[PDB]
Amino acid sequence: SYGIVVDPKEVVKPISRHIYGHFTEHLGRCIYGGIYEEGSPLSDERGFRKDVLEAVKRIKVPNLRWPGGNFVSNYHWEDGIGPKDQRPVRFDLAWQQEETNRFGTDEFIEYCREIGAEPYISINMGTGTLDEALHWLEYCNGKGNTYYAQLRRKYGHPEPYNVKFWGIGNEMYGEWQVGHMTADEYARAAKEYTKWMKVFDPTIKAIAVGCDDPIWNLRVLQEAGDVIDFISYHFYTGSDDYYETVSTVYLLKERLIGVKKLIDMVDTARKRGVKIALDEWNVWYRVSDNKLEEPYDLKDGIFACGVLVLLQKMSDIVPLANLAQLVNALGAIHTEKDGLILTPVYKAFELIVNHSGEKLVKTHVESETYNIEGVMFINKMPFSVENAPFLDAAASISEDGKKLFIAVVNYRKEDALKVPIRVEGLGQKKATVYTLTGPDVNARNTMENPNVVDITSETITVDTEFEHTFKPFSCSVIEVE
Amino acid sequence: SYGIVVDPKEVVKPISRHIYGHFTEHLGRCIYGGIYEEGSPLSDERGFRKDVLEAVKRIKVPNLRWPGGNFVSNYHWEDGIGPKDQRPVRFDLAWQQEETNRFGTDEFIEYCREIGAEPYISINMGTGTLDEALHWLEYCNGKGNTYYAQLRRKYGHPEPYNVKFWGIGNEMYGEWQVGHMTADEYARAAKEYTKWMKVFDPTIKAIAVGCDDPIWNLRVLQEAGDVIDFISYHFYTGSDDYYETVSTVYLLKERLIGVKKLIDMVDTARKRGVKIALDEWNVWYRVSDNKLEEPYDLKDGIFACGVLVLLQKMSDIVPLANLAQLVNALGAIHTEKDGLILTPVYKAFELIVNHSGEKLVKTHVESETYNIEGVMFINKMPFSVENAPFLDAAASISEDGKKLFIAVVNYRKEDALKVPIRVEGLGQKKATVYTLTGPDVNARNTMENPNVVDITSETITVDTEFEHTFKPFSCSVIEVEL
Amino acid sequence: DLAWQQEETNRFGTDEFIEYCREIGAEPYISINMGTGTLDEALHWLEYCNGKGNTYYAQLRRKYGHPEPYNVKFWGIGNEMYGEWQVGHMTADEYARAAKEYTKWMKVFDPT
Ligand SMILES: OC[C@@H]1O[C@@H](O)[C@H](O)[C@H]1O
Ligand SMILES: OC[C@@H]1O[C@@H](O)[C@H](O)[C@H]1O
Ligand SMILES: OC[C@@H]1O[C@@H](O)[C@H](O)[C@H]1O
Ligand SMILES: OC[C@@H]1O[C@@H](O)[C@H](O)[C@H]1O
Ligand SMILES: OC[C@@H]1O[C@@H](O)[C@H](O)[C@H]1O
Ligand SMILES: OC[C@@H]1O[C@@H](O)[C@H](O)[C@H]1O
Ligand SMILES: OC[C@@H]1O[C@@H](O)[C@H](O)[C@H]1O
Ligand SMILES: OC[C@@H]1O[C@@H](O)[C@H](O)[C@H]1O
Ligand SMILES: OC[C@@H]1O[C@@H](O)[C@H](O)[C@H]1O
Ligand SMILES: OC[C@@H]1O[C@@H](O)[C@H](O)[C@H]1O
Ligand SMILES: OC[C@@H]1O[C@@H](O)[C@H](O)[C@H]1O
Ligand SMILES: OC[C@@H]1O[C@@H](O)[C@H](O)[C@H]1O
Ligand SMILES: OC[C@@H]1O[C@@H](O)[C@H](O)[C@H]1O
C-alpha cells in the first residue's frame, strides 16, 4: 500500500528552474522594514537588510516579482527613479500607506543582482497607460538612444537590465483592484500592451492575468493567446485543520489542470504553447488587514513542500511559480527591528531548493489516499478533494547526472511510514537524507527559539532496494551518490 | 517495456453499464430497410428485421437513443403515433427524404423492450416547442388522466413507458441544425425545457447539448447547470492512415477531460455531479451524402475497442455513451434486402460487452508510446496526439467477484507483442482469450465473406505471472475464473 | 385581418389565386407570413404549391383538385418586417437571421 520506484536512467522532462520564484510587494513591511530599511543597524549602506539578504541568498531565488500585487495597479514607476530626495511621496490606495518611493526600479534591480534573481516586473494597468509601460520597458531594456534608455544611463546604469518577465496587469478582474476591468476590456488591453511591448523588445515573456472565472480566462486566451506566454493563476489556501490545509496541494493540482485544459481549448494558445505562471501562492487564512503578517506553522510548511514537489512534476505546464510573499507580508521570512525568523514556509524552500536536480526522472508512487471536505482562505470557503495521497514523491537528477534526489512528503499526521523504495541499477551506497519536520503540526520558529522547525540530516545506506522510515508530517530529500 | 499488472482485489470504481449504448436516427436506411422493414421475408409481424434483431440482442444494448441526430430538430413526434395508415408523410429537412412515420414512438419503445434496452429520446428544439416536448413526455411517462397519457392507453399501451433519458435538443449550436441557436439562446432554452419537464417527471435524466466551443459549454453549464444531469459530447474521427485513426482514442480522452474540467469550473454543475454523455461517437470520414454508409474496416473496429476500454476506465466521468449508429447510417451493422453484414465496429461491441465486468480493478500498464500529427473526419481537420500508447488495457470483475476480464488492445500496426502479465494472487489454471482480429488493417466483412474479421477463442493456462502473444491491431479479453 | 381591419372570408385563397394566375398567364409570386407565421407553416405552403411527391401537403393539393404541382417560382420572405405597422415586426438582426433560416430550408425542399 506504500512504495516508491525510481528509474534514474529514464528522464521524463526538465524541471523548470523558475518554479522556485518569489514575490515582494510594497505592502506593509515587505519592502520598508523587510528587505529594505535605511538606517537599520542590520542594513548595508543601500538600505538592504543584510540578515534578510543572507537568508534570501540561501534559497537561490531564480526570479523575483515586484512591485505588486494590488499596489502596482496604482503605481507610477517614474515616481521611483532618480535622486532619492527628489522622489514624490504618494498615497498608496491599495494598502493605504504613504509611499516614499525610496525603493524604486533601480534599487529593485540592484536587489535582484545581489541575490542572483531574474527581475520579474508587473505593470500598472489600473491608472497606468500603454506609453507608461513601454517607457518602463524602454528604461529597463533599451540599448539604443531613446530618452528612457539614456535616462537609465544618466542614473548610473549604462548596461540594459534585460528584464525578461513582464506581468501584464495584476488581478484586473477583482473589484478591489484600482481601475478593474471586465473580461472583454482586460482581454483586449492585454493583447494591446503585450503586442506593442513585444514590438519594442521581442525577447520578453508576457504573463497575462488569469483567475477562477473560466470565461475570463478564455477571453484572455482568445484575444491575446497569439502574443502572451503565460496566463497567471493565484492560489491561496489554509485553515486551522492540518489535513484541510495540506490536502489543498491536490486542489491546486486540479485547478492547474483546469487552466491547462482551457489553453488546450483555444487553438492559437495551444499551438504557441502558452503555459501557466502560478505567480502568487501561499497559505493565507488568519490575518486580514493591511500588513498580512501570517504566522506560518509547520502544517503550512508541509503544504509548501507539497506544492514544490507538485511543481517539479508539473513544471512543463507551470514553469513559473512565485510564493507570495518573501518577507513579512504573507512572509516566508519575518523580520523585527533586531532580527528575523525563518518560518516553516521558508524552510520548505531551504530544503527543496538545495536538494533538487534539473531533470525529473521516472517516479512511480504507491500510496493510500483520502477524501476530505474542509474550508480554505480568509473567507473559509468550503472545498473538497478526492483521493489526496498520504505519501507523495518526485525524483530528480542533477544536470551532470552525478546526483539523484528523492523528495518525499509524508502527509500522515498520526504515524511514521516505513516505505520500501526501489532505484533501478543503483549500486549499494551511502546517501544523506535531509528531513524537514518539527515536534508537532503547529510548531513555529521564534526569535527566542529559531530552530524548532529545521532541517536535520542523517547518513544512511542505500541499494537497488531499501526501506526508509519517514516521520509523520515531514518532507525529506534522499540525496544519493 | 510492455507489461500488465492487475490486482483483482483492489476495486477502483464501478463501470457504468450505459457506456455501451447505441443510437438509431431516421437517417437513410437506418430505420427503413435497417431495423425495420415492413413485409420483408426477413421481418417478423411487427416489421422488425429478425436477422438484425438477433444481431442487436447479441450486443446487449443497455440504452438506445432515437430519433436523432439532425432529424429530430425538425421532427414532430405526434406525426408518428396512432393507426399507421393515418400518419402523415413529412419531408425531413435534415436528410432530404420523405418520412412516412410508420416507425414512431410506440414502435421504438417496442423495439427497445424487445432488445431489453432503456429508451433515450431526443426532443425537437429546432421547430418544436416546450408544450410539444411536455406532451411527448406525458404520452410516454404519464400515469394520470391527462390527455396524452390517455392517448398512449388508447393506442394500446396502458402501462407508462418510463423513458428515463431525455435529450434536450441535438447539436443546437450547428448552422446545419434546423432552428440552430446562439449559446445564450440554447443555454436559456435548455434550462426552460429541462425544468418544466422535471416538474412533470422528476425522475428523468436531462442531457443538454455540449460541443467543442468552451464558451458554449460554459453558458449551458452556468445557465442550466442547476437542472441538467449530463452535458453531451459528439466525437467523429478517422483517416486513411492506420495510426491517425486509432491514436484519436487518446484525442478523445483529452477532449473528455477538457469538458469535465469545464464542469468543475461551474460550482452549481460541479456540486450537482453533472457528467458527460458521449452520445454520438464513431469513425466517420469516407462518406458524405444522405445515407452515410461508411464502409468500416478493422482499423475502425480497433478505434472502437480502444474507446470502450477508455470508457471502462473513465465511466465515472462519462457514464453514458452511444455509438452512432446501429444500422446502415454510420452503421455497426450493414443490411441489404437479403441479409446483413457485421462490421468490425459491431465486432468491437460483440467482444467487449460479452466479456466485461461491472467493476474496474487496479490495472497498471507499461507501454511504449508515440506522437502523431494527423487528419480526422470528413473535412480532414489536423489534430495532434502526444504519447499515445501502443498497448492499453483495462481489467474488470463481475458483480459476484468470480470472473476477471482483462481487455487488451495492441495498437501496433505490424508486430505482435508478447506481453508479461501479472495478476495478484491468481492460482495456476486455464482461462479463455477472446480475440477480435483479421488479416490486415483494412479487412472488412462482406455478404460473400461474413467472417473475415471475427472473434476467436482459445484456452491458455494462466498463473500469478504468465505471458501472452497479442496480435498486432487486435483487441483481446482474457477471461479468468477466480 | 389586423392590417386593414376587415373580416376576411377566405373565399379567395391559394387555389383561386393560382387559377387566376393561370387565367391571365402570370407567374404566381407568393409572399409568406413572417409576422404570426412559422417556418413549418411556410414550408407547408411551399410543399402544397410545389411538392411532387407524397408529402401530406402535396397530397392535400391533389385532394382539393390539383394533382399537378403549381410550381410557384417567386417567394417573398416576409413583408416590410422592419415597419412598426407590421404584425410581428422585427429588428434587423432578428429579420436577417430569420430570412436566412426560412430561405435556406425552403430551398432544401425546392432548390429551384
Ligand atoms: O499577496 C497579497 C495580495 O493577494 C492578491 O489578491 C494581490 O494581487 C496581492 O496584492
Ligand atoms: O486575493 C486572493 C484571492 O481569492 C480569490 O477569489 C481571488 O481571485 C484571489 O486572487
Ligand atoms: O474563496 C476564495 C478563495 O481565494 C483563492 O485563492 C482560493 O482559491 C479561492 O477559492
Ligand atoms: O495526464 C494527466 C493530466 O491531464 C492533462 O491534460 C494534463 O496535461 C496532465 O497533467
Ligand atoms: O539542507 C539545508 C541546506 O543545504 C545547504 O547548502 C544550505 O546552506 C543548507 O541550509
Ligand atoms: O548541511 C547541508 C548542506 O547542503 C549540502 O549540499 C552541503 O554539502 C551540506 O553541508
Ligand atoms: O455507477 C455505475 C453503476 O455501477 C454498477 O453497479 C451498475 O450496473 C453501473 O451502471
Ligand atoms: O450521426 C450523424 C449526424 O452527426 C451529427 O452531426 C448529428 O447529430 C447526426 O445526425
Ligand atoms: O457532425 C460531426 C461534427 O464535426 C464537428 O465540428 C461538429 O460539431 C461535430 O458534431
Ligand atoms: O473538423 C473537426 C472534427 O468533427 C468532430 O467530431 C471532431 O472532433 C472535430 O475536431
Ligand atoms: O479521468 C480522470 C481525470 O484525470 C484528471 O486530470 C481529471 O480531473 C479526471 O477527471
Ligand atoms: O465472444 C463472442 C460472444 O460471447 C457469446 O455469448 C456471444 O454470443 C458470442 O458471440
Ligand atoms: O462463444 C463464446 C461465448 O462467450 C461465452 O460466455 C459463452 O459461453 C461462449 O460460448
- Beta strands B3-14 and A230-237: pairing type? unpaired
Distance CA(A241)–CA(A239), nearest Å, equals 5
Distance CA(B67)–CA(B421), nearest Å, equals 44
Per-residue burial over B214-235, b = 16 or more CB atoms within 10 Å of its CB, e = otherwise: bebbbbbbbbbbbbbbbbbbbb
State in Å, rounded, how far the first CA of chain A is from the last one.
Answer: 28
Coil, helix or strand for A467? strand
Coil, helix or strand for A441? coil
Query: Are B262 and A214 in contact (CB < 8 Å)?
Result: yes
Q: Is B422 exposed, middle or buried (0-12, 13-18, 19+ CB in 10 A)?
A: middle
Query: Are C38 and B127 in contact (CB < 8 Å)?
Result: yes
Task: Write the secondary structure of chain B as one string of H (helix), E (strand) and C (coil).
Answer: CCEEEEEEEEEEEECCHHHHEEECCCCCCCCECCCECCCCCCECCCCEEHHHHHHHHHCCCCEEEECCCHHHHHCCHHHHCCCHHHCCCEEECCCCEEECCCCCHHHHHHHHHHHCCEEEEECCCCCCCHHHHHHHHHHHHCCCCCHHHHHHHHCCCCCCCCCCEEEECCCCCCCCCCCCCCHHHHHHHHHHHHHHHHHHCCCCEEEECCCCCHHHHHHHHHHHCCCCCEEEEEEEECCCCHHHHHCHHHHHHHHHHHHHHHHHCCHHHHHCCCEEEEEEEEECCCCCCCCCCCCCCHHHHHHHHHHHHHHHHHCCCCCEEEEECCECCCCCEEEECCEEEECHHHHHHHHHHHCCCCEEEEEEEECCEEEEEEEECCCCEEEEEEEEECEEEEEEECCCCCEEEEEEEECCCCCCEEEEEEECCCCCEEEEEEEEECCCCCCCCCCCCCCCCEEEEEEEEECCEEEEEECCCEEEEEEEEC
Residue B465: CB atoms within 10 Å: 12
Measured CA distances, A322 to A19, A346, B67, C38 (Å)? 7, 13, 54, 59
CB B35 within 8 A of CB B48: yes
Residue A425: CB atoms within 10 Å: 8
The answer to whether the Cα torsion of B342, B348, B351, B355 is positive or negative is: negative
Written as one letter, the residue type at A439 is P
Distance CA(B17)–CA(B11), nearest Å, equals 16
- Beta strands A465-470 and B205-208: pairing type? unpaired
Distance CA(A363)–CA(A87), nearest Å, equals 54
Distance CA(C26)–CA(B456), nearest Å, equals 72
Q: A224: part of which helix (H) or strand (E)?
A: helix A214-224
Query: Are B93 and C101 in contact (CB < 8 Å)?
Result: no
Distance CA(B319)–CA(B323), nearest Å, equals 13
CB B65 within 8 A of CB B120: yes
Which residue of B261, B364, B366, B387 is the best one to mutate when testing the A interface, meaning the one whose CB has the most A CBs within 10 A? B261
Q: How far is the CA of A390 from the centre of ligand 7 (A)?
A: 28
Q: A477: part of which helix (H) or strand (E)?
A: strand A474-480
Which residues, other chains included, contact B376 with Cβ-Cβ below 8 Å and sequence gap of 6+? B236, B237, B238, B239, B244, B248, B251, B285, B383
Residue B366: CB atoms within 10 Å: 13
- Beta strands A417-423 and A465-470: pairing type? antiparallel
Residue A403 grid coordinates: 546526483
Residue A115 grid coordinates: 541575490
Distance CA(A431)–CA(A426), nearest Å, equals 12
* d(CA C111, nearest CA chain B) in Å: 12
* d(CA A234, nearest CA chain B) in Å: 15
Active-site residue identified among A171, A223, A294, A479: A171
Residue A117 grid coordinates: 534573481
Experimental method: X-ray
Q: Which residues pair with C74 in a beta bridge?
A: C29
Distance CA(A396)–CA(A393), nearest Å, equals 10
Which chain B positions have a beta carbon within 8 Å of C43's beta carbon? 91, 93
Q: Is residue B174 within 8 angstroms of chain C, CB to CB?
A: no
Active-site residue identified among A280, A294, A350, A479: A280
Q: Do chains A and C touch (3 or more CB pairs under 8 A)?
A: no
Q: Which of A237, A280, A330 to mutate to test the pocket of ligand 1 (most atoms within 8 A of CB)?
A: A280
Chain A neighbours (≥3 Cβ pairs under 8 A) are B
* d(CA B289, nearest CA chain C) in Å: 14
Which chain C positions have a beta carbon within 8 Å of B98's beta carbon? 53-55
Residue A142 grid coordinates: 533599451
Return left, alpha or beta for A53; rule: phi > 0 is left, psi -120 to 50 is alpha, else beta: alpha
Q: How far is the CA of B237 from the centre of ligand 9 (A)?
A: 10
Residue A421 per-residue DSSP state: E
Place of cell 408518428: B80
Q: Which ligand is nearest to the CA of B173?
A: 9
Spatial strand order in the sheet of A404-410 = A454-462, A429-437, A474-480, A404-410, A391-397, A359-366, A3-14, A417-423, A465-470
Coil, helix or strand for A192? helix
Residue A183 grid coordinates: 473580461
Closest CB to A264 among B215, B258, B264: B258
Which chain A residue's Cα is nearest to B258? A261
Closest residue to atom 10 of ligand 11, CA basis: B257
Q: Which residues pair with C76 in a beta bridge?
A: C31
Distance CA(B156)–CA(B315), nearest Å, equals 37
Active-site annotation holds for A118:
no
Q: Which residues pair with A283 in a beta bridge?
A: A237
Q: How far is the CA of C97 from the centre of ligand 6 (A)?
A: 72
Compute chain A's Rg from CA coordinates: 22
CB A178 within 8 A of CB A126: yes
Q: Is B99 exposed, middle or buried (0-12, 13-18, 19+ CB in 10 A)?
A: buried
Window 238-277 of A, Cβ < 8 Å to B: 254, 257-258, 261-262, 264-266
Distance CA(B119)–CA(B108), nearest Å, equals 8
Q: Is residue A199 within 8 angstroms of chain B, CB to CB?
A: no
- Beta strands A369-376 and A381-389: pairing type? antiparallel
Measured CA distances, C56 to B38, B88, B107, B262, C103 (Å)? 21, 6, 21, 45, 21
Q: What are phi and psi of B271, to 5 degrees?
A: -60, -30
State in Å, rounded, how far the first CA of chain B is from the last one.
Answer: 28
Distance CA(B150)–CA(B60), nearest Å, equals 32
Coil, helix or strand for A21? strand
Nearest to B231 by CA among B189, B168, B291, B287: B168
Q: Which long-range contacts (CB under 8 A, 24 or more apart) does A157-161 make?
A: A157/A106, A157/A109, A161/A109, A161/A119
**H-helix segments, A69-129:** 105-115
Distance CA(C90)–CA(C102), nearest Å, equals 14
Q: A258: part of which helix (H) or strand (E)?
A: helix A248-264
- Beta strands per DSSP E along A379-464: 381-389, 391-397, 404-410, 417-423, 429-437, 454-462
Q: Is A402 exposed, middle or buried (0-12, 13-18, 19+ CB in 10 A)?
A: exposed
Longest CA span, chain C = 41
Nearest to B269 by CA among B226, B230, B316: B226
Check if B236 has its Cβ closer than 6 Å to any atom of ligand 10. yes
Distance CA(B234)–CA(B201), nearest Å, equals 27
Check if B378 has its Cβ closer than 6 Å to any atom of ligand 10. no
Active-site annotation holds for B280:
yes
CB A25 within 8 A of CB A284: no
Coil, helix or strand for A28? coil
CB A16 within 8 A of CB A62: no
Active-site residue identified among B118, B138, B171, B350: B171
Q: Is residue C38 within 8 angstroms of chain B, CB to CB?
A: yes
Written as one letter, the residue type at A309 is V
Chain A to chain B Cβ contacts (< 8 Å): 29
Q: A52: part of which helix (H) or strand (E)?
A: helix A50-57
A70 CA: nearest ligand 1 atom:
10
Window 208-227 of B, Cβ < 8 Å to A: 212, 214-215, 218
Per-residue burial over B305-327, b = 16 or more CB atoms within 10 Å of its CB, e = otherwise: bbbbbbbbbbbebbbbbbbbbbb
Query: Are A214 and B212 in contact (CB < 8 Å)?
Result: no
Written as one letter, the residue type at B81 is I
Q: Which residues pair with A430 in a beta bridge?
A: A461
Which chain A residue's Cα is nearest to B362? A366
Compute chain B's Rg from CA coordinates: 22
Check if A89 has its Cβ closer than 6 Å to any atom of ligand 11. no
Residue A251 grid coordinates: 486542489
Distance CA(B157)–CA(B164), nearest Å, equals 17
- Beta strands per DSSP E along A15-149: 21-23, 63-66, 90-92, 97-99, 118-122
Residue B44: CB atoms within 10 Å: 11
CB A378 within 8 A of CB A288: yes
Distance CA(A135)–CA(B97), nearest Å, equals 66
Q: How far is CA A64 from the centre of its chain?
A: 8
Q: How far is CA A224 from the centre of its chain?
A: 24
Which chain B positions have a beta carbon within 8 Å of C109's beta carbon? 91, 93
Q: Which domains does chain A have, with CATH numbers?
A: 1-15+357-481 (2.60.40.1180), 16-356 (3.20.20.80)
CB B256 within 8 A of CB B218: no
